[PDB]
Each structure stands twice: as structure tokens, then as C-alpha cells.
Ligand binder design. Structure first.
Ligand SMILES: [Mn+2]
Lengths: 10, 323
């Protein structure tokens, strides 16, 4: 299982 | 006019970087919801207002069986609150972190539902979702998909109208977003290809811990598949994961309709998909509405109650559903 991810914007 | 005293505050479902989500009960009705609570202070410091407002408008302006619905949004002096449909079944991320992989038929089911919802966002609402991933695909108590988080949607996108903003989740970014040279609504099909690849293959199609190396793989490496994947699954995944959005399945004027015709979905009747008549092949084993087993025990175990430019007033933020 991959690690959990986070979104971003810019 | 709704306020925080209309709800009991039972359990922490999880905590993001700009707020928290609380499993709540509305006093007057007995109905459970998930309430997103944002300190206004935090929102403003982090330049996160626009996303929050985007989320509010997209949720107001959407109703689909596979999109998390908004019941209420309101504000207090210092806070913003979205009261949403509660996805009892947790994230598919959680489910795929415990199972190594799902069957083709299981992924077909979730795939069908996600297509139904993205189709509606694209063709009925002109919304591009842009952040499809396992973390944002949640299940309801019966095991149907509920897409959550709309703060990265783009509103107003029609036909091959382009977008410019670099955003999403790194592992999920489409090659044309990493190229930084204008992108269209086909980024959502690239995400659908990534999630379905993860469901059937057990891993992301491109991985490196380092983003810049990850992005290089995404732009340059040819897709490969486990040699047990069926040929209709492969072909679907090949089409969705074309690096050139013009060559991507769903990349033309027909959008979702091209994916809906693909032989991987043959014999799926799309209207029956929309009416929730497909048999969800995993039913969540929730004893009750406060059973949070499919949520992260990190957050579940905590027992907490808390009930001018730094803390502004958001005009016309508030909203109530049923209309
Ligand atoms: Mn989220």
C-alpha cells in the first residue's frame, strides 16, 4: 500500500 | 437558519490541514452527517478561501447519487461548516490498503459509478473535478461510490476550453498538467485510469518517492501491466492512460460517452448505474451509524468537543438543501 497523499494548488 | 446547537458531536472522522470532519447527529431529525469545520482564521492565513468557496458553489450546484451531497452550510463568528452526507464505508484508499487488489468485476462496478458522476459534472454542470484519487472516493453504507472534496474543481469549462492552474495530487497528475501548457477536462479521465489501475493492479502506474522523479516517470515511461490483467481491462487502462489528451479515451467531444462505449463496460446499462441497481460487490459491515471501523483509528479514538480580515464574514455563504 502506498502512503496516503495530499493535494495542492499553485 | 442552521447553527451548531442543532447537532450532537459524536466522533472525529478525520483531520486535514485546514480543518476537521466530525460525525454528527442533527437533534431535530436523528439523521447522521459528516460536518467539515474550518476555522476562518486558518482559511484566510493559508489562502484557502477560494477553494472553500469553490467547494460551496459546486456542492450547492450538484445532485447525483455518487457525489456527496451538501445538506447545510452556515457560518459562525469564527468558523465555517459544511454538513454533508456521511460516507459510512470510509475511503477506498483504506479498503485498497488492506486488500492488495480488487477483482476486475469490482473495479468495473466502482468504475461505472465514477463515470456516471464525472459525466454529470462534465456535461450537466461543466465542472472539471481535477483531484480524483482513492482518498476522495468514499463508500456509502451500501457500498456505492461517493466522491467528496470539491475544493479543486474548476467551474465553467465547456468543450475543449482550457485551464492553467497547477493543482491536484502529485501521484495523480496527468502528463498535460505536468507539461504546464494548458489542459482540458480529459485530466479527469487520466485520474480515472490511475484509480482503476490501482484497483486492478495493486499499485500506482508510476511511483517514486520524489516528486520530480515521479513526474519524470509520468511524462516519459511507457505504461506496463501485470500479465494476469484481462485484455478488456488493459485496453481500457491503455486508453485512459494515453499521455496525449487528444489520443485519450474520453478526450474528444464525446467525453464520457467514449468511455461508456468501451468493451470493458459492455452490457452495463448506464441508466441502471444511475438508479443504483448494480449489486455492490462489497457491502460495508457497519453495525450502525456510529461504527467507524473503516476510518483511521488515529482520529476515531479521540474524544473532543468544542461547540475584520483575519475573521471576516462570508456573504451569502449559508445554504439549506431540499430544493
Ligand atoms: Mn479530503
Amino acid at each position: 500500500g502506498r502512503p496516503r497523499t495530499t493535494x495542492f494548488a499553485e | 437558519r442552521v447553527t451548531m446547537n442543532e447537532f450532537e458531536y459524536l466522533k472525529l472522522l478525520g483531520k486535514g490541514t485546514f480543518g476537521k470532519v466530525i460525525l454528527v447527529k442533527e437533534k431535530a431529525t436523528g439523521r447522521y452527517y459528516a460536518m467539515k469545520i474550518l476555522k476562518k482564521e486558518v482559511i484566510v492565513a493559508k489562502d484557502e478561501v477560494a477553494h472553500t468557496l469553490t467547494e460551496n458553489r459546486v456542492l450547492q450546484n450538484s445532485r447525483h447519487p455518487f457525489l456527496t451531497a451538501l445538506k447545510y452550510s452556515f457560518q459562525t463568528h469564527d468558523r465555517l461548516c459544511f454538513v454533508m452526507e456521511y460516507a459510512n464505508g470510509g475511503e477506498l484508499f483504506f479498503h485498497l490498503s488492506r486488500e492488495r487488489v480488487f477483482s476486475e468485476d469490482r473495479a468495473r462496478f466502482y468504475g461505472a459509478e465514477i463515470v456516471s458522476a464525472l459525466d454529470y459534472l462534465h456535461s450537466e454542470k461543466n465542472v472539471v473535478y481535477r483531484d480524483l484519487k482513492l482518498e476522495n472516493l468514499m463508500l456509502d453504507k451500501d457500498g456505492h461510490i461517493k466522491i467528496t472534496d470539491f475544493g479543486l474543481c474548476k467551474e465553467g469549462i465547456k468543450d475543449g476550453a482550457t485551464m492553467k492552474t497547477f493543482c491536484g495530487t502529485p501521484e495523480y497528475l496527468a502528463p498535460e498538467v505536468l507539461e504546464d501548457n494548458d489542459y482540458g477536462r480529459a485530466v479527469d479521465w487520466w485520474g480515472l485510469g490511475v484509480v482503476m489501475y490501482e484497483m486492478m493492479c495493486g499499485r500506482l502506474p508510476f511511483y517514486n518517492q520524489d516528486h520530480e522523479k515521479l513526474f519524470e516517470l509520468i511524462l516519459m515511461e511507457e505504461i506496463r501491466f501485470p500479465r494476469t490483467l484481462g485484455p478488456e481491462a488493459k485496453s481500457l487502462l491503455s486508453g485512459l492512460l494515453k499521455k496525449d489528451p487528444k489520443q485519450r479515451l474520453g478526450g474528444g467531444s464525446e467525453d464520457a460517452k467514449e468511455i461508456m462505449q468501451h468493451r470493458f463496460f459492455a452490457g452495463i446499462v448506464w441508466q441502471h448505474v444511475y438508479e443504483k441497481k448494480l449489486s455492490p460487490p462489497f457491502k460495508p459491515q457497519v453495525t450502525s451509524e456510529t461504527d467507524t471501523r473503516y476510518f483511521d483509528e488515529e482520529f476515531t479514538a479521540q474524544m473532543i468537543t468544542i461547540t475584520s480580515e483575519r475573521r471576516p464574514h462570508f456573504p451569502q455563504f449559508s445554504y439549506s438543501a431540499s430544493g
